[model samples]
Target: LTYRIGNGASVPISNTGELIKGLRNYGPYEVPSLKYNQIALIHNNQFSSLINQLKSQISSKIDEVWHIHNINISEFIYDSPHFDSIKSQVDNAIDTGVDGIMLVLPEYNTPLYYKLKSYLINSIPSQFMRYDILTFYVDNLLVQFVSKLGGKPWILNVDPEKGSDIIIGTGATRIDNVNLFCFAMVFKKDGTMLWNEISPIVTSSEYLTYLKSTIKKVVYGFKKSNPDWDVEKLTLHVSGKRPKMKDGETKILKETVEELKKQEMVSRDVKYAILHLNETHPFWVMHPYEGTKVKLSSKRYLLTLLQPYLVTPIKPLSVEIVSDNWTSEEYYHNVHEILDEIYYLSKMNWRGFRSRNLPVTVNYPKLVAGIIANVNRYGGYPINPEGNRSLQTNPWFL
Candidate 1:
C-alpha cells in the first residue's frame, strides 16, 4: 500500500505494541537508480542555430555520453542518394559508443520527420543500439523500436508482417463550429492507415448513423486490406469509457453490431470491446526507469500518469468488468492489447518527437475537429491543398 503524506510531519501517534513492531521492518520509499553507457540525439537539421539550445536542454536535464549527428533528409523514399546519406549516418552512429538515439525535430517539421524516421527502420539494417517504440514496447528494443508511428506500411495485398490491430474512434468537442463533431481512423497492425474522414458534425440520429457506418467501414476495410484477418475475427478498440456508459447508447450500439452479423460483415463470434482512459479517477501509474520516465522497450512512459494502463502502478488497473461475452483469457488479453495499442497510437502525432499521453484515436481526430471549427469561423473550409503528404489517407482539416 502506498501512503501520500506531506512533509509537515506533524505530531506522531503514540506507539502501540503493533506500531513498535512496524518500526523495525518498514523504511522510506526507495527510488530506483539507472545509468546509460552512451546516448545519441539524431536529426537532419544538425547545422541549425537552435541546435545548441536543444543540446543545452539535454545537458541540464541529465548526463550521458553523447553521439550527435545532423543527417539531411530531403526525401522519404529509399532509392535516392539522400536515403543513402541517412543510412550512412545511422550506421556511423551505431559504430560510435552510442546505445540509444532520439530525433529532435521542431513542431513545424515533424510530419517529414515522422515520415523519415518511419522509413529509416526498414532501410537501415539492425544493430546493437536500441529504438524503444510505443504501443507494445516489445521486450527487445534493438529492432522493434524501429517502427513508424501509425504511418502507412506497404501491406495492400500481402500483410507479410501480421500485427493488424484496427481501431475506430469517435470524439465530440465544442471546438468544432458544430459544437459537437466526430470522425474515424483505421490503423493497420503495421501502421497502414486504410481510411480517414474529417467527418462533418452530427446530431441526434445522424450521430448514431455515422458511428454505425464508420464501424461497418472499419470491418469492411480491415478484411479488404489484409488477406489473413477475417471480418468476424477482427478486434475493435473504441473510445468513450469510465464515469458512465449509457444503456441507451449501448443498446443502439449492440443493435447495430447485430445488424453487421445479419449483413455477415463480422464473425458470429467477432470479439470486440469498448476502451478509454479514465480522466477523472484518483489513480495514476508511475515506474521510473531512467531519471523520471518509465522506460519501455520501444519508448518512454510519461513522468505524469495522464492515462491508464494495466501495468506497474499504485495497483494494476482494477478493471471493472461489465461484460457478458468476454469471460475468458481472450477478454483479459483484449484489455491489455487495447491499452498498449492506444499507447502506440499516441506516438503517431506529427506535432513533435516527444511522447503523448493520449492515443491518435482521440487526440488526432479531436485536433482535426478543432481545426474544422476554426476554419468555419468565417464559414469557410480553409483547407491546405497539400496538407501533409506523409498522411496520404488522413485528410485532416488543416
Candidate 2:
C-alpha cells in the first residue's frame, strides 16, 4: 500500500507517495539555520561583557559544529534603573527577526521578571538560562512561563565549587537562592555517565544503571511474552552506539537483537530502527581515535547497516545526532548533509524517518503547537484547527 509523507514544509498529503517516489535519493540537504537573541545582558554589569564574549564563542562554536548559518544575539537593555526595563527589551527583541531568544535573569529581578513574563503569551520562542543572580522562585516562574509560551527553558547550572558558596548563602534578594547547585548524574542506555548539575540532589549513578538495566529487562520480557512475535518485524529505536563491554561484562543487547532475528520473531513484523548520537556523548567531545570526521562517518556506517531491516512502507524512519548545542553552523551543516543522505536512503526504500535530540526539559509539545499555529496564521499550511492535538493536551502533568 502507498503512504503519504510530509516535511516540515507544506505539501498535499495525497501527493506524499509521489513525492517520495520521485526522489532518486536524498541529497546532501542544507542544514536548518538557527538564530540566537540574548536577553538580560544589560543588568549583567561586570558579567555583561563576559557574557557577550561567551555568546560570541557559543555562536561560533555552534556554527562550527552544526554547519548552519542562522544565528543572532540581542541585548536586553532597559534604560530604567528599575528592573521593569526588561519588558521593553524583550518586546523589542521579539519585534526583530529571531527564531528564538536566550534569556538571562538579572539580579534582584525575580518579581519584575515574573511580571514581565505575563506579557509574553506565545509571542515568540524563548529559552531561559539561569545566570548567577536568579532566585529559585524566579527560575520556577521562568520555567512555567517558557512552558506556557511553547518554548524550552534550560536552567544553566554553575559549577558548585565555583559558585556554591554564593548560591547557598545568598538569599532570594540576591537571585542565587535557587537550589540549583546540586548535581544529578545518571547512566544512559548506552552505558555512559550523564550529569545534570542544576538539580544536584537527583544525582545517583547507581539509580541510572538500574534504570538502564530495567528498560532492557522490560523490553526482552515483552518479547518473551509474545513468542509468536517476529523479532525482525519489530523495529527498535537505539540511540547512540553500543557501549564498549566492560571487563567480564556480557553484551546482552547485541545478543538480544541477534537472537530475535534468528528466531524470525521480528523478521516481517519489525521494520527499520533508528539510533541517535547524543550531543554530550564522549564520542562527540574531544576524542582520540575516531576524531570528529571519523566519528561522523561511523554514524553514517551504522545507518547503512540497518538499511536491510529498515521498514520500507513510505513512512521515513531516521535518526538525528544533535550537537552539544545547535548553535554551531558547521556541525549543523554536516548533520544536515547526513540527514539528507538518510532522507535519500529512505526515499529509495520508501520508508519513514524521525529525529531525536539531547534530553531537554523544554515544553516541546507547546512549542510545536505554537509553530503550527503560526504556520497556519501565515497561510503556510492549510491545517484544520480541529485536528490540532497539541492544543488539546493539558500542560500540567497528572
Candidate 3:
C-alpha cells in the first residue's frame, strides 16, 4: 500500500479586524495566543481599506502598543531610495517604540519582490550553475532593495525572508517543526515547457523520476546531517490535475518505497500516502451565517491527512488517500483531527506566510515551473542534465 500515513475553524463576522481576531482558521488562530509587541506597519496606497481592516486585526493581536506609510508598486517596482527613506520615516514615526514591522500588500497584484525572486530562482535551476547572466532592471534592483529591508520582521505582505512567520505547507509542521516535507506541482503546457500547474506542473515521468531520487536524497541528507533525530515515514503529496488519483500514480509511488525497501531504507510497514490536492474544485464553503459578502470562510473546516473532506474552505486540503497506512482507527475515523492536521501543515509557506490560503506544495511548484516556462518562452531556460538536486526540497527555488 502506498497511501497511508502522513499526515481549523472560524469565528466571527465583523470587519477585517474581527476576521483577523475571531477567525481561528489555522492552529494559532484556531485557539489564539494573542499578545502585544512593539509594532510598525509601512503603508501602501493600494491597500488603503484592506490595510485599515488589517490594522483592526493587528489591533486585536497587539497588547495596546507599537505601529503606516504607502510604498507604491512604482517605488517597489523601481529601485527607489525613498522606499527605505519612507521606511526610515516610519521607523522615526514609531520614534520611541517598535518591535516588528508589517507592510500592507496590494490586493490587486502580488508584490514585486517574490515575483522577481522566481526569475533569480529560475536563473539558477542547474543549467547555469556558474553564470549570473540573467537580469531584469527591476529584478536586479531588488538585490539592493533586500539589503534595505531583508533582516527585519516583514510580514503583513508577502514575507521577503523566511523568518518569524506562520507557515502554510503540509506536514505536522506544528510549532517549530520548521522543516517539513514541502511540495510543489509542475506540468507541461506545451512541449519542452513544464509548468507547476493548478497544483502547478504535475502530470509526471521525467518529473516523477526527477522527484523520486531527489526526495530520497533529501531524507538521507537530513539523516546524515543530523543523526540523533528519527527519520519518520514519508508523506507523498501530489497536486493532481484532476480530483481522482491519476493512473499508475499509486504504482509510481510504490516504486519509491520499493526502491527504498530494496536498499533496506524502509520497512514494508514504513507508512506513506499520496494526497491529491486540487484547489479549484467547484466545492465552495460559505460563511456560517452570511454577515457581509459571504465569502468562503465567513467563519472553519477540518484538515485531513488521507481521507478527503469536500465541504469547507478551512479544510485546507483533502485527499484520495490511496493507501493510508497511518490510521488512527484502521478504517477512516476522527476525520476532523486529520483535517486539523492538514490545516496546520498549510501554515508553512514563506511566500504568503499564513496569509497564503493553499499549502506551499500545491501552489509554489506550479508557479516555479510556470515561470520557467514563461521565461523560456520569452527566451529559453537552461536544462540541468544533472537534474535539479534541490528542485522540490523545501523552498530551494526561494
Candidate 4:
C-alpha cells in the first residue's frame, strides 16, 4: 500500500515509522488554506512552564507544515483546577476570536474532560492534552489540530474514479442499557470523511428501522455534498460478529440497497457488499516476510495491520463477508480487494503520528459512540438542537 503526500508524492506504507518518515521528509498530504491562523490555548496556570514550552513547539510545527504566516497564539488561563473555575475561563475563551482551541490540563480528569468536551465540541474545533502526555505526543497534537481545521494530513494513494464510491462503516456502543448506533461514510478515493452521525439510544427492536434510515441518510448526505458524483458500489463494514438470528444484517442491507436503487439514488447496476468485522477470535497468522494474516473459509480474513513489537502477541482482525450479489469470479476478486483496501485504510488514521491498526470506518464510529457515552455519563448530549451541525465536519472526538 502507499500514501499520498505533499506535491503528489506517494510514500510506501510498511509500518508506522516508515509512514511518519515520509511525512517528515516529504510533507503533509494536503495543506489547507485555513480561514484563520489563530489558535486559543486554554489551560491551568499551575503548569505555566510546561504549557509555555508546548505552545512554542506547537506554534512552530503548525507554521512549518501549513505555511501559515506567524500563526497567532492566544492564551486563556484559569487559576483553579476545578471545573467551575475552568468552565468560566473556557466560556470566556470562546468569546475570543480564534480558529480553534487547545485545552492543556495538569493531569487527566474524566469528569472535567467529559464536561468540557461536551460543551466545546459543537462550538468550535477543539482538542485536549494532559500535560503529562504532552512530551510524548506533541506531534500527535499537531495532527489533531490540522484535522480539526478540516485538513487531510495524508490519504491512501488509491484511484478516486474507480472502486466503491462510498464506504460506510457501522458500529454500536452500549451505555446505561442503551444502544447507540454510529456510522461514518468515507470516500474510497482519498479516505476523506464525508459525513457521520450517531443515533439516539435505541432498543434491539428499533435497531433495524434506525439502521435502514441511517443508510439512506448517509447516501442522501453524500448526494447533498457532491451533487454530480455517481455512486457505483456502496459497501458497508459492520463491526462485530455475525448474528445467529433469523432476520440477519445481510437481509436488511440488501433490502435497503434495493430501495435506493429503485429511487434512482444509486445506480441500478450498483454492486455492494456487507462485511462483518469480528475482533474476538481465537485465530491469528504470522508470515516470515508478509508479517501476519490469515484467510478463512466462506470468505473471511484475519488481518494484522499494526505490529508494535515482534515479540508481543499481535491481535488480528477477523472480517467475514456476510452478503453480496456477484459472480463467483467477481466474488473472489472482491474479497482480496476489500482486504488490501482495509490495510491501507488503517494508515489513514490521523489521531497520532503512531499510525493506528483499525480503519477509520470502524474506528471513527467507535470514537463517536465513546464520546457520546462519556457525555451521557457526566450529564446528557448537548448537541446543537438547530441541527447536529459541526460535529459531522470536525473530528472533535479525537
Candidate 5:
C-alpha cells in the first residue's frame, strides 16, 4: 500500500514506523494554502507555565514541520472554573476574531467543555485540551488544531482498482434517556473524508426512519457532486452491542440500498456489506513471530492491524457480517475482504501519527455522539438541528 504526501508524492507503507517517519521528512499529504494567522487560547491560570510551554512547542513545530510561518497567539486566562465565569470568559475570547479556539482546562470538566463548545461551535471551530497532558501531547494537539482549521494531514490509498467505494461508520449515544445516532463517511480509495452528521434526538421507535433517511441523504449528496461516478461497493461498520438489540439495523440498510438502486443513484450491480464490530470479546490469538497472544476468534485469523509496539496482552475486536442475505460460501469469501478493508480504515485516523486499533468509522462516530450530547445538554440547543451542516466538512469535533 502507498500514501499520497506533499506535491503528489507517493510513499510505501511496508512497516508501521515508515508512515510517521516519512511524514516528518516529506511533510503532510495536502497542505492548506490559506494560512492560519491566529489561534486564540483560553485556559485557567492554574497551569500558566505549562500552557506557555505548549504554545512555544507548537509554534516551532509548525515552523519546521508544517512550514506555516509567523503565527500570532492570543490568550485569555480566568480564575474560576464555574460555568458562568467560563462562559463569560469564552464570550470575551470569541471577540478576538481568531481562526480557532484552543481551550485548556485544569481537569476534564464535562459541563464546561460542553458549554464552551456549544457556545463557540456554531460560530468558530474550537478544540479542548487538559492541562495534565498538555505538555506530553503537543504534537497530537497540533494535529487536532490543523484538522479543525481545515487541513489534510495524510491520505491513504487502500484500493488499487480505483472504483468509487465508500465506507460509513455508524454509532449511537444516549443522554437523558434519549438515543442519538451519528455516522461518518470517507472515501475508501484515497481516505478522503466525505461528511459527518447526527440524527435528530429520537426514541427507539423512530430510529429506523431517521437512520434510513440519513443514509439516503448521504448518498444523494455524493451523487450530486460526481454525477458520473458509480458506487461499486458500500460498507457500513456498525459499532455497538448489536447482539442484544433486535436486528433491525440490517433491515434498515437493506431498505436503504434497495431505495438507492430503485432511483439509479447507485450502480445496478452495487454490492452492500454490513459488518458489526463488538469490542468486548473473549477470543485470543498467539503471534508466532512474537510468541504472544493477541485477540482473534478460534475460528481464527491473524490481526495484522495490531502494531508491534503494544507490549501488553490486549483484547481483540470481534467483527462479524450480520446481513443474512449471503450464502455460506459467499459469506466466507466476503468476510475476509471486508476485514481487509477495515484494516485500511483503521490507518485513516488523523488524531495521531500512530494507527489506532479501532478504525475511524467506529472512532469518529463515538466522538460526534459524545461531543454533541455534551454540547446539547449544557447549551440547551437542538441535537444537531437541520440547516446547520457547516461543520460537516472539517473535523470540527477534533
Candidate 6:
C-alpha cells in the first residue's frame, strides 16, 4: 500500500507514532515481518506538531528497521510573497534523499507555483508531487498552472455517476502520465445512495445475503469465462457507503446477522468482510430516551449487534467506524462495548484473536483475546488450532 503524509500541522500523529512502534515490535512477537526501511516519513513545517510526534514515534522503531531517512520537509514557503525565499526552502527539502516530496500549493499564487516547479525540476530527487491546490482548488487555473510548471500534479475526480466528460483535461497537459486516485460508491439498481441514510443501520440480513450472492456470481462468472486464470491471484473490490449505526439499530444488526448465519447460500470463499461506519451523524447525541443519558443505551445496543458474528474465525473481517468528531470517551466506550461483546461470544468457541487499524500498524491483542473468548462461548470457529492459523492468514474470511 502507498502512504502519503500531508495534513495540517494540527493533525494528530499519535496514531501514526503508535503504528511505527507496532511495526517494530511485530517481528519476533507477531506473525508477519515488516522491515523498517519499508516505511517512509515525510515532514512539512506546516504540521510541526505532527512532525514532532512522528519524530518521537520513530525513535522507538529506529533500531528495528534497516534504513530510515527524512525525505522531505513540508513548509508553505510559496504562500508568502517572498517567492525566492520559499524556493530556497523547497530546494533544501529535495536534497534530503527522499523518494518524493509533497507540497500543498497556495491557490492564488501562480508565480510561486512556477518557481516551485522550477526548483523541483532542478532538485536532486527531481521526482515530486503537489497536493491541495491543483486538484481541490475551485479556480480554473489548473491547466495553465501545470502547463507552465514542469512537475506532476495529483488530482481526484469523484463522479460516482461518472457523468463528467473532461475526466483528464488537466492531466492531459503533462508529458508524463499523471496518476489519478478516485473513489466511487456502488449502489443497487434502484439508485439508493447506500451511505446517505439517517443512521445507516443494517435493517435486514438481505444485504449480507445479497453481498454473498454477488461474490458468488463474480467468482462463477470468472471461472466460466477464464478457465485457465488463477482465482487466488484475483481479488474483488467491493465498496459501500458508510452509514452511521446508532443505538437503536443494534437489534436490527443482530437480527440481520442471525438471518445471515441461517442462510445456506452464504459464500464460503469470502476471505474478508469490512463494515464501514460514518460516525458523524446526529443520532448519537446523548439525550433522554426516557430520562437517562443515552451513552450506555447506545453502547449496549452496539455490543449486541457486534457480538454474534465477531467471535467467529470464518473470515477475517474488519469494521471501521469513522469517528472524526467523536469524543475520546465516546470512542473508547463504543469500541470497548463492541470488544466486550465479542469476548463474551468467544468464550463459547475458545478462539484466540487479534485486531489492527488501517493505513497504519497498531494491534490490540488483549481486546482480540477477549473477543475470541466471546466467540468461544458462542461456538465460533477458529477454536481449533488449524482454524486459528487459517484465520490469521486470511484476514478477510467471512
Highest TM-score: which candidate? 4
| lDDT for each residue of candidate 3 in 250-362, tens digit (9 for 90 to 100) | 56565766676565555445655555555443333543411111113311222322212123433324444544566656433323323333343343333311224444455
Residue-level lDDT tens digits of model 1 in 1-398: 11111121111222122221222233111111212334455655434545454445444322211111232211111222243555556656656644334443334432343344434322322222122112112111211222212211111121334344455554334442333444556665433355654334555435555666656654555455455655433434344321123565455556656777776666677665543332333344433521132223221122223342223333112112222246576654655554455444543433322323445455556556555555445333333223333232432221
Each prediction's RMSD to truth: 16.2, 20.0, 14.8, 2.8, 4.1, 20.7
Candidate 4 lDDT over residue span 312-389, tens digit each: 345567788878877887987888877776766766677876656677777766677677778878873455413654
Could you tell me every candidate's TM-score relative to the true structure?
0.46, 0.28, 0.43, 0.89, 0.81, 0.23
Q: Order of all candidates by lDDT, from best down to worst?
A: 4, 5, 1, 3, 2, 6
Where does candidate 5 stray beyond 4 Å? Answer: 1-4, 8-21, 33-36, 44-48, 176-178, 182-189, 241-247, 282-314, 324-333, 376-385
What TM-score number comes out for model 1?
Answer: 0.46
Ranking of candidates on TM-score, top first? 4, 5, 1, 3, 2, 6
lDDT, each prediction: 0.39, 0.31, 0.33, 0.69, 0.65, 0.27
The sequence of per-residue lDDT tens digits that candidate 2 reaches over residues 1-398 is 11122122222212323332322122111232234433322334446666766566545532442233444455665555344466567767777655545566655555445443333323444445455532223323333332322332111222223221100000000112221111112121111112111111112323234323433433344345455533332222233222222221123333443455554534533332223322231211211221012233523422221112222212123343411222354454645444433322222211111112222111122233333334333433322223222222212110
Off by over 4 Å in 4: 14-26, 160-164, 176-178, 240-246, 282-293, 308-312, 380-389
Worst lDDT run of 10 residues, candidate 5, spans 286-295
Model 2 clashing-pair count: 56
State in Å the error of residue 201, model 3: 10
Clashing pairs in 5: none
Q: State how far residue 15 of model 2 sits from its true place (Å).
A: 42
- Whole-structure CA lDDT of model 3: 0.33
Residue 242, candidate 6: alpha-carbon lDDT: 18
Provide backbone clash counts, one per model.
9, 56, 47, 0, 0, 35
User: Candidate 2 or 5, higher TM-score?
Assistant: 5
